[PDB]
Amino acid sequence: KLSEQLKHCNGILKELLSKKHAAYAWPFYKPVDASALGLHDYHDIIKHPMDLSTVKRKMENRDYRDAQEFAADVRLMFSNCYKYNPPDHDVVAMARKLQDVFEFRYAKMP
């Protein structure tokens, strides 16, 4: 019923992680390494971080009831990025490109 939804959501997640979109997806593969980047205020501004490895773990853990919940985390990931950064920063451009793939594939599911 909605296990078919989550099966399609799993397919989206594979696409998002795939090599073809890697030039814009790579900054969302792992949690932002605030420490390495020298960002003292990242966890002050982003209360609930999110990234695709996390989304994958929750997928495998069956933590998502339905596709809305999947989509809420994926959008959280992008919004965090837009929230933290100025609009001229390369990571924002990249988030936009990857959200295009996501919004498209998520619109086409049953």
3 binds a copy of itself (CB under 8 A): no
Q: How many residues bind a copy of itself (CB under 8 A)?
A: 28
Under rule CB under 6 A, which residues in 41-100 are in contact with ligand JFR?
Answer: 81, 84-86, 89-91, 94
Q: State the binding string over 47-66 for a copy of itself (x if CB under 8 A, else -).
A: xxx----x--x--xxx----
Q: How many residues bind ligand JFR (CB under 6 A)?
A: 16
Which residues lie closer than 8 Å to 21 by C-beta, 6 or more apart? 15, 97, 98, 101
**Residue 69 and residue 73: Cα distance in Å, rounded?**
7
